[PDB]
Symmetry: D2
Subunit: 512 residues, 4 copies
């Protein structure tokens, strides 16, 4: 059998594991959406085309680097690459665009390299004149209060926490420190101050500018950096302004406080990013996996998208093949229950961006087939409280029906994505094919595992009921074309009693 079905029929998790079969070919669209960071390696229209073809679903713009003009070019190229496939509506793949916020970063000064000798004296300055006078015994940083916040005996991580510094006297013109971990240091590198309370705002003048930019260029999603408390996302919301309620806000969890106040942060956000990079510097590297698995679990419970991020395939920045740990990282993110998996170096600057995307694609398909739905579904139902919202009620119904007949797909009409979401919330195995007129909602829905958006272009029919049927039919055809559904398959169709959003309430079983 295929799809790891013998494994799906197991009575225990152990028996399940014991039955995973390397010769059981996956046989389903991959449900985990891939987010790819745009950079020099992935910015040319022709490259983007390849990346789309290979599996990219979300383009991530990292506003930690590049000017407004630079990101506008990125948006313009993505949109071009994406619309090059509009020749065939039945095959067209929407691509989301996520603005990633700079946030309260700290960076060293200005392709040369100094060497911080272990045990040696290094001075950290925020004096404007030393802004480029950086050397083996002097590092300049762009956070003037550094001197006010890192006390004697405090730690200062530099460059992915690879360099490490102990403050051994805080004198007038800077921090007198001793290198604890040396390393070959380069230009403008990221700095971390664990244990220190960085009074740096979650939203600086630039972030606000950057957000307004996102509104004007119609970005779909904000990955909000360094989110430490509910008011942080409120601030993002305010900045996003009224022209931008539609925009999904994904809070990146990058530090201890963020981890601790996670519950409050989730309730107020549209989803979460396990921001492992910073997280892995702010808390001990041994402990990330706990935060990751805790947050993914909690999101699964709340029904919100969760993203797993950073170094999932690092070696690929430089090599055509991933390390054995990277492969298992991707699979375990999926098995953890992550809605999306990300790429950074691997697609922004590396020598194999398309190969990197093909790999997340390949692994996610295997891992998705290896999900023990039986336990998963049971636990979700069991944990999720009762509900009175007809849309939820239909969803779980639909998912249940899908399971009973091994439906190829659940086809949903949706206006804002919400009813597609409520379906994927319960993790059907059948694919959730979402038919929508809202180009934006079609993009934002990539954030939810197992949704395949289809953008519908025809003008409304006179008779609403007809309009509904043409759309469902549209789903089926697109379905047939991309090999999601074959003649003789059963499909579950979810619709509503009247137009407008918020009235989903019907579930139907149809045969193809």
């Amino acid at each position: 059998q295929q799809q790891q079905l013998p494994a799906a029929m197991a009575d225990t998790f152990l028996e399940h594991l014991c039955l995973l079969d390397i010769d059981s070919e996956p046989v389903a669209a991959r449900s985990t959406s891939i987010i790819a960071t745009i950079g020099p390696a992935s910015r040319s229209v022709e490259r983007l085309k390849e990346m789309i073809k290979a599996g990219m679903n979300i383009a991530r713009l990292n506003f930690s680097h590049g000017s407004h003009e630079y990101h506008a070019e990125s948006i313009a190229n993505v949109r071009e690459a994406v619309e090059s496939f509009a020749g065939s509506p039945l095959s067209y793949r929407p691509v989301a665009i996520a603005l990633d916020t700079k946030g309260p970063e700290i960076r060293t000064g200005i392709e040369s390299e100094v060497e911080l000798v272990k045990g040696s004296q290094v001075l950290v300055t925020v004096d404007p004149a030393f802004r480029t006078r950086g050397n083996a015994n002097t590092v300049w940083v762009d956070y003037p209060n550094i001197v006010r916040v890192v006390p004697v005996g405090g730690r200062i991580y530099i460059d992915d926490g690879l360099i490490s510094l102990v403050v051994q006297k805080i004198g007038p013109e800077g921090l007198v420190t001793q290198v604890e971990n040396g390393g070959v240091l380069g230009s403008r590198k990221g700095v971390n101050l664990p244990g220190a309370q960085v009074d740096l705002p979650g939203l600086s003048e630039q972030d606000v500018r950057d957000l307004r930019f996102g509104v004007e260029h119609g970005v779909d999603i904000v990955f909000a950096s360094f989110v430490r408390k509910a008011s942080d996302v409120a601030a993002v919301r305010a900045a996003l302004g009224p022209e931008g309620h539609g925009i999904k806000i994904i809070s990146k969890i990058e530090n201890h406080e963020g981890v601790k106040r996670f519950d409050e942060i989730l309730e107020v956000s549209d989803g979460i990013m396990v921001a492992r990079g910073d997280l892995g510097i702010e808390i001990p590297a041994e402990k990330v996996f706990l935060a990751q698995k805790m947050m993914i679990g909690r999101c699964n419970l709340a029904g919100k998208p969760v993203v797993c991020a950073t170094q999932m395939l690092e070696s690929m920045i430089t090599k055509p093949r991933p390390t054995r740990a990277e492969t298992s990282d991707v699979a375990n993110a999926v098995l953890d229950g992550a809605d999306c998996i990300m790429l950074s170096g691997e697609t922004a600057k590396g020598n194999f961006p398309v190969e990197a995307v093909k790999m997340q694609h390949a692994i996610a398909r295997e891992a998705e087939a290896a999900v023990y739905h039986r336990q998963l579904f049971e636990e979700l139902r069991r944990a999720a409280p009762l509900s009175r919202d007809p849309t939820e009620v239909t969803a779980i119904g639909a998912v249940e029906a899908a399971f009973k007949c091994c439906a190829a797909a659940i086809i949903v009409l949706t206006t804002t994505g919400r009813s597609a979401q409520l379906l994927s919330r319960y993790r059907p195995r059948a694919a959730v094919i979402a038919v929508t007129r809202s180009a934006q909602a079609a993009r934002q829905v990539h954030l939810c595992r197992g949704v395949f958006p289809l953008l519908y272009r025809e003008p409304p029919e006179a008779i609403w009921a007809d309009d509904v049927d043409r759309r469902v039919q549209f789903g089926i055809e697109s379905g047939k074309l991309r090999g999601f559904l074959r003649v003789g398959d059963l499909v579950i169709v979810v619709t509503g009693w009247r137009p407008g959003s918020g009235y989903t309430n019907i579930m139907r079983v149809l045969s193809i």
Copy 2:
């Protein structure tokens, strides 16, 4: 809270038990249908009316007693009592009629100048069992006549003969030319025409005698809804019932009564071929050791639950009530446990056929079943059923389970289903929703037969079809709601799950909708 909801939310069966609350009032129509046997105590139109009011859903005609004329009067009186409530379609309660077959019984003769007189079989004495036609009526303390010619040829020396609900006990010591010389092993007081059981003897009597066949044809002609088939031992037995029922009667549901060891052993083959099962505890309780019935009962109920077929629990559920206005503590727990076991219907016999409290007896099964229905640990039950039931490609099943699931998620007060033959109402109840299954149908018969399936409340719909089919569909669903409101099944603010189909005719159910009342 009500409906034993704290108990419903328990994480284990033990925790569930630990949270059952005597002050949590049930709050739902009772889902276990009650079958009542018709006799002198329950035959008058006015009595029937009371029994309907009290909860009766199936009238059982016991063809072991009475003539054709006698049962025709019963049917006529039921139907009258039933139709007396047709003045209000929104409140009308359909009542099924079940013909219960005589089958291969054996009874003693009539007593010497005494149909209502008693002889006494003393422990340790010689009793001759005769088949001699001349002794039918001549029977005494040392002589009992029996209506089974072959008895003399089937009980060996050392073989046991039970008389009267197994309370009398004879052991064959000598066989002879003019009967069985027996010694009374258990004595007691004996009357006329009492049931005989022959465990250990293979009884070569047919499952369907010339009379049964006549009885069955009778059932066809008078439009009975259900056949409780006695002494069903193997698949061919129900085939025989089917043939006899003839072509004028495919619609009739066949319920095999399981009354003996062989029947218990070939149960699987019998179920596959029957519409449902009756755990016939009376005979079963004599054919196998009394200690073992509970095992057959729980096994069969379990298996039916699995197959999704109606199962009936029967006999002595409330015996003391034949004679007393209150049940014994075992009787009460018997009913509750039949329900908790997972029985679709519970029966009454003596209690409604001859006893002094037939209505009180019906009211009691009503009261207990409501409590017990609320105490079912659906969480486990539902999980196990899904888990056990094979995948399915039939859109009707698919919608059913969907509907049940949706119902659970919002504590739906009801699932309302349009159904033509009952099948989609049945597939719902197969998954044991807690929300009541309100089945709307134009088939008066299907409305009656549906009582066989736990949790289905049938509503007979009387209006002529609208021109636009979609409108006809809506009026029906609306009809369900209103009836619902009126009988306190649904209150304003409830959510309800509506199940319908894409086109007319049966077999095409495939839609599930969430509506608020």
Copy 3:
């Protein structure tokens, strides 16, 4: 296979039910202890001997009736019957003796000219209930007198009044200047001095009257083992029993009978303070609606199972047998379901106290309990208990669960425990092993009280201590094995789990060993 093993190996409760097998013979001592009530039917030494042979483990003396002298004779006769088997220590069966308290009973008066004669209260007729001192003797078909002046003040117009076991039903339709003008709801033949109940109406008689205290002091002096304490409504009720029991009687296990609504509601507090519980169905079934008892029964048994305390199921489990040599189908299933519920003991009252078949009645509870015990789905049962029971630091508990676990893994025939006060035997049964708990003790009393715990089979050990303690330990273990072999609990080639301790005196169990027989 035997012992319903296929059914034990099932992955779900449903599959379990589906695999119960009527041909799978039980093969194990029955673990549910049987309490028999002593009366005219069961007071003769020779009868008692039969009842012991048949399975009785606890004699229950019902102090609601009979004088001190009368109960002394009962004790004497039991002890005589019991010690008649002392000729063989390997086979000797200890029998507990439980004193059942009268408590705050409410009663009717003596009849017009008839300490034996009878009045009929006809359904629908006017009935005056006086509290008038004069009429305590002047009762007829329209006048019943009652020994509780306050009844007039507590039952409001429209309230019920149940009489004699709840078989007679009166409704107050007028409160008058000397009596409640009642209509007869339920009719029937009324006797002299019968029990009256007042549901919903709150009562104010003490839990412990001057007589109870006397009765308790009596129990001490005659060395009763167990007090079944009637009408326990709150923790202080058992404190009172404890005080009355006096210092000569800490050893005595106190079982609170739960007989009313308040008792049901304050159950948690009552359990914490008692050694065990009695589900007193009789009264309970009159105080709260008859439909609801099964809920109180299953909730209490569940909670006791959780707490690890003995729970008894009681009253009417086999009533028809008071009068008939076979039980009704409901009675059989009642017993099975008590066991499946998880009851430690099952009781008999009328069936053994007055009826015509006391020994047969005891043989039946024995026969059913064995079947039902084999049908427990231990897999779930064990899982749930572990899961629910909090961590523990007491080495005795820790050894128990370990022992139970080891037993399961090798289908041990038995767990053999040395115990001084019964406590380590109890902690084993607490986890419901399937293997039998063979408890070896020198305390004749502890040997009796242990019957209160499902699955414990006490063996009284008589030899004087050896010089070397270790040797004394081994002879006792060996004693268990031999007794074991002799009664067919263990066969050559069986594995057995032996639980002992590091030093003498109670409270130090901490060793578990696997041995082969």
Copy 4:
């Protein structure tokens, strides 16, 4: 609370996940043993001392490289480093030594292979040590070179270019490699292992039961004691796994080769399947290769590496390995310290509730008194949050049977057999203590002194504190195979 106890008390796996707490400090010896490969970075006695201190439990000698003399020096150095702590029997840490077999490898001879260009096999000329290559790769066959980084399609054509070094691993999937599992050299290497008293054989390229039979034959009679760990490195091996496991003492998920022989996407499936099956069989299973590669070069692991380790433990692995990280890299001790740190966190996060349930449930009934005592002991341990289960064991088997059920309390195994003490590291949760005193006259006393020994060693290393409960497992008579007693004692 500590040890992720709130998460242990969860009613579902989801709820469990939801309750993992980064501020819940682990508080227990780490139970996953660490296998470290010896090389230039890790061969000096002083280095070895550091690596023992940091957590190493098994030294891995990779016979794919180095001469006999070279491996003798390694053994010698390990043994020295190890015995330098013998100053104190209560603290002494035994270190196993595992001989890792070369087996049917293929390597290149002693340059950048351009994408597109011609390359013959016997810059435009790679040499290979497997003469039959010409015989088993047909027109349109694939030849991987160096950790599957290069790809050659058959005369070949380069499909994937790359920078080629000296003597590098060649892989041929789809081809049936008729090279023997045991060459003349392997046999020599194995005989070597016997003579120098290695403890464990990691047997390379195990494809079928007869492969381990061959290893067994070569190991000879002087070496029945030696535990044999079959390395699963290819498709056939994955397919015939059941047969292989039944006949082996344990398994190594040899990800490196496996990741080249089967698609990289699929390894995690083989890994989780094998670890699951081993957990079921009660045999040790090893997770291997690249668990921390970046550390070969960098002082900190990547985020994928960290999660790789934790997931191996959560998968249920008995041991985790390091190769380049400790054999040649610039951070061997840091690498060992990391596997130590992660394994402790991951171990505390195991959802025993489910795990234990499932193992009981799955494991068939048993009549062997040792098993019966084990499960009993584990059950007792759970009920009182025992700090430890202390077992007397002669061959390790009763320690093994305990760990088979994954207690959370640590399994402190007391033994006289120095070797058994070493091999027991293969079983999660076993902490061996070597006992040196001569037997007492009264056997019962000898038993007690040993149990007492375990307690004291326990106290000293902070496994058990006064007031803890401990579970003690012993037997009714001397000699192995008769464990049958379980006792609850307070410290």
